[PDB]
Amino acid sequence: SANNPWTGFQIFLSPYYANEVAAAAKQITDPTLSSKAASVANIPTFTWLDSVAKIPDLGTYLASASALGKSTGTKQLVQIVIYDLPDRDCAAKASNGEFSIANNGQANYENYIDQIVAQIQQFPDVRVVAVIEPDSLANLVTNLNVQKCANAKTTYLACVNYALTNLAKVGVYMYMDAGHAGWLGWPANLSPAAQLFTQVWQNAGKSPFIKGLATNVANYNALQAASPDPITQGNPNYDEIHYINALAPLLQQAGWDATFIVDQGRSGVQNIRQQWGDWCNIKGAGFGTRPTTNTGSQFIDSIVWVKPGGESDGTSNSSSPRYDSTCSLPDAAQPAPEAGTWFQAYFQTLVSAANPPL
Incomplete structure (x- = not known):
């Protein structure tokens, strides 16, 4: 579209990932690989606001970005993930996250949003891009048979609506999470997905700050694959470009010229x-x-790094209260530490196997 949130801005680089990365790179023994690893701290990632405890970090990043822009003659942009729904990740094995529907979850979530808004309101010279709630709305397309998801449906919709409505008041550019090609990109899931996303957009007032959708968050799909990955058999939309090319026109027809x-x-x-x-x-x-922003697609504002590679997706220890058996499958790296915590061996392989090379 005409307004790509990233054009003309410098992305504030996460100091936490830079340090996570800095601490990680000093443990990599081969000097060539260690220096490549250190350079990952210069690659912009999203900051996950996965709990209220992360909100003070947001305030510091906004203030630091504001000062850095003045020091360098740039306009700065801070990248965040809103990720604290009550009954979070309803289709996953094991619960996670600080809020529950049964214990004031929606109210606690709206206070979490209010605290985020109150930070953002203080720093109007910093642009913010937010990914809204990975692993939420996509469950309301395909996983309504999961009782936890069915019982969370109204809360997820109300909470996402509150986030969109109130972050728009402080000018945050927003992309709702929309799964990936192997989730919502199946042709038969496209129209139900579009209908859900459009209803959400309508309920939040069709704000121009609701730019569109984020895909492949924390996943592994190709944007454009020359050959389909065998896992995709049965789905003509075998990569993210096929998914996005198929979904976008359905949103456009609803009056939402969405970008991704x-x-x-x-x-x-x-x-x-x-x-x-x-x-x-x-x-x-x-x-x-x-x-x-050189994405090759009319529909895609940016290729991004949302999930910070090197942070674990979950523990492989079946004795943890947070254990999800997906994290012990044959194609899962093991042993793995608790979610969001650093997985050093995984990071080193992400560096070694980087493509394009670092």
């Missing part, structure tokens, strides 16, 4: 999964195409 961002942070290596739904710490993943 696509995670490629762990997409450098294709054909590494037994089944398409295997999502946890997939072994042999490599860093993929670096973030860029």
Whole structure:
């Protein structure tokens, strides 16, 4: 579209990932690989606001970005993920996240949004791009048979609506999570998905700040694959470009000329999964195409790195209360530490297998 949120802005680089990366690179013994690993701290990633405890980090990043822009003659852009729904990840094995529907979850979530808005309101010279709630609305397309998802449906919709409505008031550019080609890109899921996303967009007032959708977040699909990965058999939309090319016109017809961002942070290596739904710490993943607005598609504003490669997707320890058996599958790297915590061996392979090379 005319207004690509990234054009003319410098992306604030996460100091946490830079340090996570910095601490990781000092442990890599081969000096050539260690220096490549260190350079990952210069690659922009999204900051996950996965709990209220992360909100003060958001405030510091906004203030730091504001000062850095003045120091360098640039306009700065901070990239965040809104990821704290009550009864989060309703179709996953085991619960996670600080809020529950049964304990004031929606109200607690709206206070979480209010705290985020109150930070963003203080720093109007910094642009913010937010991915809205990975692993949420897509469950309301295909997983309404999962009782936790059926019981969460009204809460997910109300909470996402509150986030969109209130972040728009402070000018945040938003992309709702929309799964990936192997989730919502199946031709038969496209229209139900479009109908859901359009209803959500309508309920939040069709704000121009609701730019569109984010795909492949925390996943591994190609943006454009020369040959279909065998996991995709049966789905003509075998990569993210096919999915997006199919979904976008349905949104346009509703009056929403939606644009997209696509995670490629762990997409450098294709054909590494037994089944398409295997999502946890997939072994042999490599860093993929670096973030860029040179996307090759009318519909795609940016290739992005949303999930920060090197942070675990979940523990492989079946004794943890947070254990999801997906993280013990044959194509999952093991042993793996708790979600969001650093998985050093996985990071080193992401570096070694990066494609394009680092």
